[PDB]
Amino acid sequence: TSYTYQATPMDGTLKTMLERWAADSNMQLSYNLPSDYTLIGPVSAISTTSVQQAATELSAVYAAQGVSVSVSANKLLVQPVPVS
């Protein structure tokens, strides 16, 4: 096999990969960062049928850059990490 969330040869950047995941899922992408970013090596570990798992793995990859990736309704949401 079934569809899996992963990086593929088509995807060069964080935003563009997520545009594909969103299109593949009938979801909105809200990309709330000032710049796109290249995909870094650790993204190559992601391969899962679960959008929650995939988004969360991706979030962890970009956490040290200050980024959160999450599933919010029909949206993939990329934003600065909200903290109290």
Domains within the chain, CATH numbers bracketed: 1-84 (3.55.50.70)
Q: Give CA 19 to chain center in angstroms.
A: 9
Identity at 53, one-letter amino acid code: Q
What is residue 9's three-state secondary structure?
Answer: coil
Report yes or no: 54 and 5 within 8 Å, Cβ to Cβ.
yes
Between the alpha carbon of residue 35 and those of residues 14, 31, 50, 56, the distances in Å are 10, 9, 26, 20
Query: Which method, experimentally, gave rise to this model?
Result: X-ray
